[PDB]
Amino acid sequence: KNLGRIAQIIGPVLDVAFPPGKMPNIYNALIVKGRDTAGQPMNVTCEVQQLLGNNRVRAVAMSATDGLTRGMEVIDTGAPLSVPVGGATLGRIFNVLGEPVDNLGPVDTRTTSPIHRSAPAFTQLDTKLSIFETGIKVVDLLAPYRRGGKIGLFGGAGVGKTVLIMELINNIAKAHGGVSVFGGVGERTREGNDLYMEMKESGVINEQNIAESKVALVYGQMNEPPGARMRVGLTALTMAEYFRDVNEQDVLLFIDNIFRFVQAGSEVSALLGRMPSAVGYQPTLSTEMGSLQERITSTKEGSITSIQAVYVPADDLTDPAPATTFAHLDATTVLSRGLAAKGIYPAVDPLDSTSTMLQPRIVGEEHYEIAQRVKETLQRYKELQDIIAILGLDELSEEDRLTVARARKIERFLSQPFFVAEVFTGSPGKYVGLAETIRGFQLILSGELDSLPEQAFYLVGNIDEATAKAMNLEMESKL
Amino acid sequence: VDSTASRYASALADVADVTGTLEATNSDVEKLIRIFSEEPVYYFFANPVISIDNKRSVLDEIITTSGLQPHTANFINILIDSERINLVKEILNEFEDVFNKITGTEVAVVTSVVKLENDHLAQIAKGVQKITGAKNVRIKTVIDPSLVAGFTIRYGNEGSKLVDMSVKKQLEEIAAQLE
Amino acid sequence: YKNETIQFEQQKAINQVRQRVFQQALQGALGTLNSCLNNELHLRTINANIGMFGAMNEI
Amino acid sequence: LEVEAKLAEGRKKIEVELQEALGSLEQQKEDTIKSLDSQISALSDDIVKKVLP
Amino acid sequence: TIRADEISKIIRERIEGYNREVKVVNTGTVLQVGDGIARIHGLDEVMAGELVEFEEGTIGIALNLESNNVGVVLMGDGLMIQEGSSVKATGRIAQIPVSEAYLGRVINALAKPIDGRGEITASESRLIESPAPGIMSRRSVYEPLQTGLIAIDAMIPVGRGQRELIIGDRQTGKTAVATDTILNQQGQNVICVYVAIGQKASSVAQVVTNFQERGAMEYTIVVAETADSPATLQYLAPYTGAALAEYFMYRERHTLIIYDDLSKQAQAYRQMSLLLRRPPGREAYPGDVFYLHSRLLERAAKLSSLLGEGSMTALPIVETQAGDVSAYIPTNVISITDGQIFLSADLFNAGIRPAINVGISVSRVGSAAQIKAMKKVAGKLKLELAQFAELEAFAQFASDLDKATQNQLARGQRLRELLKQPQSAPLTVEEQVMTIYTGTNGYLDSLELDQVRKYLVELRTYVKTNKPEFQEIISSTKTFTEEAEALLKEAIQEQMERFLLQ
């Protein structure tokens, strides 16, 4: 119920002067009552970052300060940025403020939640290491995901990263009772619009019957001020933990990407005048990242698993922005431009993708023994590509005639059709469980399937579907 | 504005307001401004080298002849203890702006080529209390010849808001004929 | 393009002559107005200026 | 090379035409400043009715 | 040229219908002037970003609205601004007059003409700091922007509505990539804006001389802030250029804009910010330099059919320092921009001109920019220059290899001769399909590398004259049809017969 006055506007940074008793505490939302270009009222939302002393706070605006005047009245809300949560958020694109920017009306909700929040307690955690079942054969074998862990995508565009994300949204909604939240931290508006229309096209956002949709999009754009961009990840996360805590679901969170969350905090801190840390980042980088990443956890109610894209500055993995990110990560999925040129979809690199979960005390010995044989077979074939270009297959040893034929069969059987590409290619997608993945690569490596052709494993789901495509080709070749 | 000079002056006004000596304190503060104008008097208080103990004794004698308010004598003693006597002049000037705020009064500045009459001043005060919301209005006059015939008033919280018709006709007609 | 330049210099000649003529007019009017009686002009002027002031404050 | 030389000579001719036209119009504005003086008196006399109500 | 007859009315014309209205203005007094900054006491009601006007006529923008003063950055030299002098806020926030009649006018950063050719007739105004279109106002990039270079328009394709970055070190050909793109759209109906921030004035005059000869100024605005100008004018010059390009884009017209170095704009906003006492970061830049360029480049994209499908294709140019792509201003714009066009001086000195490093250069739109005729043919150019990129170590050892490898070394050395264009010789899309069809389908393996340049120039002028039915297949259908693949091969075997005789 408090009215403040703007004391100064320096960039996106405001100083607001309050009465001596009634006073906001840090992270509360300030609503600046401003005027527009023409003369109508339009309000600017902010967030208290510093208490400067002498009843004066320092705020960083969530929108443009262009046209704000020293001495306009500012409403203290008494709470941080509250953002609508629920099933009213599914299929909608949101602002930082929880405002729908997709021009489909207002959000007809009755529930909000503050975006600044403590972690779940030490009691409330789910200590059980569960593997997360994605339904994708490269991931579920070679780079498994925690249920409740943080995953990294090392991929650009032209690698099918947008198709790989939509498959994870569709698999968590079908196989489990899950939802997803995509958070666009500092996203381009061209690729932000490209992602929303391909989600409409792939049926993942249901444009006709919304709230039957699978995603909630939260987009912070690049032309937003740096305060908003710092906040979008949290706003996305607050929607993701409504489905975790209240609906007891298993959520995917997506931060694209987590580096732009870092550089937006580096920009705000430089605007707030903080003496910077090593290599130019904010001195609070270890805790600004830790505030976002410790809310992403598996509780006893549900879990939120975040698959977050990671940009490596200067191709330096020891840089403080990946080094603080990689500490919280639990698996890395390297997407490959070279594997997409061969035609393999999903174009996940099998040899450079890692996990902390591929340990035999976690995934079991039958899965750990087979994922090492697949990696050793694919690493031996990566070595032999210069020898096949010099000798050819007939001059290699008989032990190594097989590890080319098997590894060429593994590279095909790692590929998979997706449900989100049924309009694009026509071939129906396949959800492949972890049970049928291990039984698939046991047959290829034990050598039972050395009679089948190579192009019977390409874009098939199960290992039974492999022999079905092969027996079709023996019936198609004879005709 | 919120600077150290302003900060101190605001405190001095607040204590007067509490004790209902706003008229009584204001007279004393105006009385102080005459005292600290003198280069020799101001220099003695301001410089670090003269011993602080000597400064208090001289200050006490000055207070007695002056007959300042009990808080006002304290306020200077507080400034001297806390080293901010180098900015007394800024503080004293700052108090006047604060004192108008507390009363709810406003100040205005009206200027002319030749001296003018009291009814004009009262009607300008009427108009300034209208457009400003003075609880009460206040007025000042400065005779300047280099205009043509008009009057310029100057008001606001700072000396900011300005309306006039003397030479703004002529400069406006230059800038309107370039159109 | 040269005829474009000549038309621009017609514009510039007109503009500088107009402004120099007007500054001559201004300083002549200023000399005459400062030659005028102070009491007669000002009383009407202050009264009308202050009336326009109060009128625009009503407006 | 022949038509480039023709271009350059024509360009000189149009340059001298330019200088003649500009010097002429500067002499013209010298003439209308040296003349046109009742305009000056009436233009002073007209604005004196506008500075005062 | 008659004046003095109608001067005796025009003085009485401005006095007629003159309002003389008394309205409240916000006045201030000048505290201090220095380095193009004015700290101002008062202006209690000024809004952030507002133009204020001084005595002696200098205009400045109130940027720091601080608690004691207002930090005003001057749009000119503040040499005649006196301590204690008045200053009044004008009421408006940084407009330009905007019009159709800017096409051909070299204007400066307030869109006043500097070409000495008269005023510009304008009736509407655009805001300089205008917001970008949102997400629902846009459409996917699907139309090509033909730059006229084979190395770009085949392998790094720029579409309409795309922000692409031309980047490299100094004297690599960044301006020539941008200038030849403007020179290519003489037939396309795009409107080009060439913004030149912080350049030498002699090189702005050479670009407009290059543009006026080749008829490029009939569809071009040149926005120019020479390095003599204050840093406010250099900071606002691409925002002035982007406001002019948003005028045509909202009037359903497609536009290209080039910023001649965004690097010098960032240095010109670092200058004002360090003089406004704002706390710096990496390379003394403020935190807003990303938010400077992201607020600029996101205004340039492709609109939806509900708005009329105007586009604004931004080609920002950024200069790096000794190839330091990880420097602070290259790191920002590579994140903001879709594609990057990397220009290297080790290819510029070797003869590969335009010096596009096509391996490192990327385009996030991808093949959605290209037409269907170009997708077919440049699918083979990308693979076969990637096979030559893996075999660059083997070019010294071409003899000691099998024929499957040695033909790839022989093919890739002619595919790089396709990419070589002289300066200001852009190719039409039909001429680009001929050149890549000939090279990627074995019809140049018989030639020495000295002759691959001479052969294609004679084959491009052959089909232009002798076989004009090829150009109508590609202009209208925009697909490399089986008819035109037959018609092109008849031109090759007749040109190879005439070129071998010579």
Ligand SMILES: Nc1ncnc2c1ncn2[C@@H]1O[C@H](COP(=O)(O)OP(=O)(O)OP(=O)(O)O)[C@@H](O)[C@H]1O
């Ligand atoms: N395709 C080309 N073939 C031959 N020369 C070229 C080509 N492109 C550019 N040049 C020449 O290279 C020189 C540098 O080109 P340009 O002026 O475009 O450089 P730049 O990248 O703008 O560098 P700077 O920003 O330092 O001026 C120019 O003299 C130009 O004539």
Ligand SMILES: [Mg+2]
């Ligand atoms: Mg250049």
